[PDB]
Design a protein around this ligand. Structure first.
Ligand SMILES: [Mn+2]
Ligand SMILES: [Mn+2]
Length: 755
DNA sequence: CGATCACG
DNA sequence: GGTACGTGATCG
């Protein structure tokens, strides 16, 4: 038995066949299972009811659907024995066809485990864990460059370069003559796409790495392949890449391989105002990368001048995509293994969903019936539910960052905080949460505390094996493993409060907050007696300084302080020194900005680096943050805003800095609310423009009476002689909102930021 | 106001 | 194979 990399199912003669994709001593192996059956559970009012319930019918694919077999089973629900009926079906697609017919029934109290994908059901029930062993996978980074012109329909412009990279080097396929050693020149867009197919089939990578390939590279390749009448047999079974709807965006799978899209991974792992490949590469490897903008690529392609510069950019995009994939995949591979689900799914999940998958597997192992996800009504009510400090103003120097998160798993375990132990009837001994008063039964270990204890013990064993290991290879692997456990264990606190959670528990989250606070108040008091000033406190951590002290002294005392507190705090309760900042300011909870000793600005919940904000607002905000953090000058920042707003009043700002960009996401007739970008889009369609979802609309808001939608103009129609932009809109709805939250940390109101 | 829409 | 989340802007 090798290493499981993915699992799915195919249908044959109307029957499902599970496919397990493996890597076994360097070779691709596919195992087939025809015997695993889909099922749901039904809790009935009485055993007699099963005779009526087993006879429930549905329709799918022209043919009727039936319950294949029924089985009475004894399980645990809410920490209590329960008798339910396992209802077997022939095909997994039968479940969404019959589940509501079963739930409808007057004798059915409730149904359970009815929205678990068949391939994930299989992995859990068969006790199969992906990414186990030392099996070495192969990787290939792939990227593309397209010919783009302002506001074009997705896929109108051809693909002009395809790049790929591995340990053999970074290469470019193009259909215009470029003399570089790494450039392969082919005859057409069609032949370039066929060459990428040939490179993928010959290299046969286990992992295809992209940077946002879910939304750009693969959807674009598929669109161009369609127009060109060619197939993309990239799957190991010769199937084409498959587009999956994840939210409003996309997810692309390549069967028998792992399509590893770094974009969701990096977005979760590191904190940046923009997730451009250049910014990401610099943040991870501390090296600068050149950007070649779309308009420059179009000019070079159309003119045929400066093409060597475009091919170098395409080559580097693949090269750095390969380096980033190799950097980030080991941790995704260990998280996959820990939660027992494929890297494809895990690399695209929130920590809340990682917890749920860990809990679902553990629920099967422990014969525990899993709770259902909430309905729309329950999900909204949880978002409404109310739970039982304000930052220091001004600009602070020499800020130390302390992390509290490794406190909470220990609190959950010691106080047996779990939905199954909350306010239990006929309980002999209980823990009472401070202030909130929630009672947690001590008579049996709760489902979650029990799992968390095993997680923490497993991490301590790995850490002990690391000290006693003389092998640098296993030390590396074990380091990723104990880190993966820390990430999962530290996600439970937040999960209890996650409105979409199965094991959601508001009282659990408040109780943990109430018990946690006693340690937060201890840290705060011990810091304050040491001369430290606490500037910001969240359940996650704090920021402190020693007013008027030398930076080395603040660091030394802080490092001494964590060493001291950890020696006083019992068990696995741990304080962590996160870092040091030269300067910083705090607005409210998770709204702050800091600058490190290397000059990098780190912010949370403030920056507006997005295409639906004008350049003038983004430019002014970056300038305000630089004046404050790099220059230590809030008076400079206030003067910057006053100058910009006056310049907008006097029509001194170039119209290119006033453009707003917003995507059309549906046919124009499907809109309920006609926002400015849609009003502009309708006028374009009226003119004969082929408006399609995906098209990004550039507009400028003009002066006039009424709502902005009636006053917005397409950028290509804006004439500086004829049209006059709305200075009030750019001052009040763009520039001032971008800077008013930042400046409020220094005592300014919106009204103080003009002449 | 509540509903609708889009960013990354 | 169910088809994201948190958050702010703008519409109706
Ligand atoms: Mn899959
Ligand atoms: Mn690119």
């Amino acid at each position: 038995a090798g290493m499981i990399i993915d699992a799915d199912y195919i249908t044959e003669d109307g029957k499902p066949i599970i496919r397990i994709f493996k890597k076994e001593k360097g070779e691709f192996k596919v195992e087939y299972d025809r015997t695993f059956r889909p099922y749901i559970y039904a809790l009935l009012k009485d055993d007699s009811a099963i005779d009526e319930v087993k006879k429930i019918t549905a329709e799918r694919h022209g043919k009727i659907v039936r319950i294949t077999e029924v089985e009475k089973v004894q399980k645990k629900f809410l920490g209590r024995p329960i008798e339910v009926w396992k209802l077997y079906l022939e095909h997994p697609q039968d479940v969404p066809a019959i589940r509501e017919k079963i739930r409808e029934h007057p004798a059915v109290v409730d149904i359970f485990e009815y929205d678990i994908p068949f391939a994930k059901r299989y992995l859990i029930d068969k006790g199969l864990t992906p990414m186990e062993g030392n099996e070495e996978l192969t990787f290939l980074a792939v990227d593309i460059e397209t010919l783009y012109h302002e506001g074009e329909e997705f896929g109108k412009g051809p693909i002009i370069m395809i790049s790929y990279a591995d340990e053999e080097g970074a290469k470019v396929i193009t259909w215009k003559s470029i003399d570089l050693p790494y450039v392969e020149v082919v005859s057409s867009e069609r032949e370039m796409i066929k060459r990428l197919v040939k490179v993928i089939r010959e290299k046969d990578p286990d992992v295809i790495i992209t940077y946002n390939g879910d939304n750009f590279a693969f959807p674009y390749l598929l669109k161009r392949a369609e127009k060109l009448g060619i197939k993309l047999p990239l799957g190991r079974d010769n199937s084409e890449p498959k587009m999956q709807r994840m939210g409003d965006s996309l997810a692309v799978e390549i069967k028998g391989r792992i399509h590893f899209d770094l974009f969701p991974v990096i977005r979760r792992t590191i904190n940046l105002p923009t997730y451009t490949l250049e910014a990401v590469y610099e943040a991870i490897f501390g090296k600068s990368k050149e950007k070649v903008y779309a308009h420059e690529i179009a000019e070079a392609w159309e003119t045929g001048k400066g093409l060597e510069r475009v091919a170098k950019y395409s080559m580097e995009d693949a090269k750095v995509t390969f380096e980033l994939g190799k950097e980030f995949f080991p941790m995704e591979a260990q998280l996959a293994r820990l939660v027992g689900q494929p890297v494809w799914d895990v690399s695209r999940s929130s920590t809340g969903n990682l917890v749920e998958w860990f809990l679902l597997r553990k629920a099967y192992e422990r014969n525990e019936l899993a709770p259902n996800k909430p309905d729309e009504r329950e999900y909204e009510r949880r978002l409404r539910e109310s739970y039982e400090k304000e930052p220091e103003k001004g600009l602070w120097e020499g800020i130390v960052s302390l992390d509290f998160r490794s406190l909470y798993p220990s609190i959950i375990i010691t106080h047996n905080v779990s939905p199954d132990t909350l306010n239990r009837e006929n309980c002999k001994e209980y823990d009472v949460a401070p202030q909130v008063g929630h009672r947690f039964c001590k008579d049996f270990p709760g489902f979650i505390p029990s799992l968390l204890g095993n997680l923490l013990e497993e991490r301590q064993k790995i850490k002990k094996r690391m000290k006693e290991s003389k092998d640098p290879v296993e030390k590396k692997l074990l380091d990723y493993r104990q880190r993966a456990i820390k990430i999962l264990a530290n996600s439970y606190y937040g999960y209890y409060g996650y409105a979409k959670a199965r094991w959601y528990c508001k009282e659990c989250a408040e109780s943990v907050t109430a018990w946690g606070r006693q340690y937060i108040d201890l840290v705060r008091r011990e810091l304050e007696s040491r001369g430290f000033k606490v500037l910001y406190i969240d359940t996650d951590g704090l920021y402190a300084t020693i007013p008027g002290a030398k930076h080395e002294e603040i660091k030394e005392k802080a490092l001494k302080f964590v060493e001291y507190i950890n020696s006083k705090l019992p068990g696995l309760l741990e304080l962590e020194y996160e870092g040091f900042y030269a300067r910083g300011f705090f607005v409210t909870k998770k709204k702050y900005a800091l600058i490190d000793e290397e000059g990098k600005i780190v912010t949370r919940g403030l920056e507006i680096v997005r295409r639906d904000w004008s350049e003038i607002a983004k430019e002014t905000q970056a300038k305000v943050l630089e004046a404050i953090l790099k220059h230590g000058n809030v008076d400079e920042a206030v003067k910057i805003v006053k100058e910009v707003t006056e310049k907008l009043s006097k029509y001194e700002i170039p119209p290119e800095k006033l453009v707003i960009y917003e995507q059309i996401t549906r046919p124009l007739s499907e809109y309920k609310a006609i926002g400015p970008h849609v009003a502009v889009a309708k006028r374009l369609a009226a003119k004969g423009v082929k408006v399609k979802p995906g098209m990004v609309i550039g507009y400028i808001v003009l002066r006039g009476d009424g709502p902005i939608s009636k006053r917005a103009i397409a950028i290509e129609e804006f004439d500086p002689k004829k049209h006059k932009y709305d200075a009030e809109y750019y001052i009040e709805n763009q520039v001032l909102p971008a800077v008013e939250r930042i400046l409020r940390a220094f005592g300014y109101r919106k009204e103080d930021l003009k002449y």
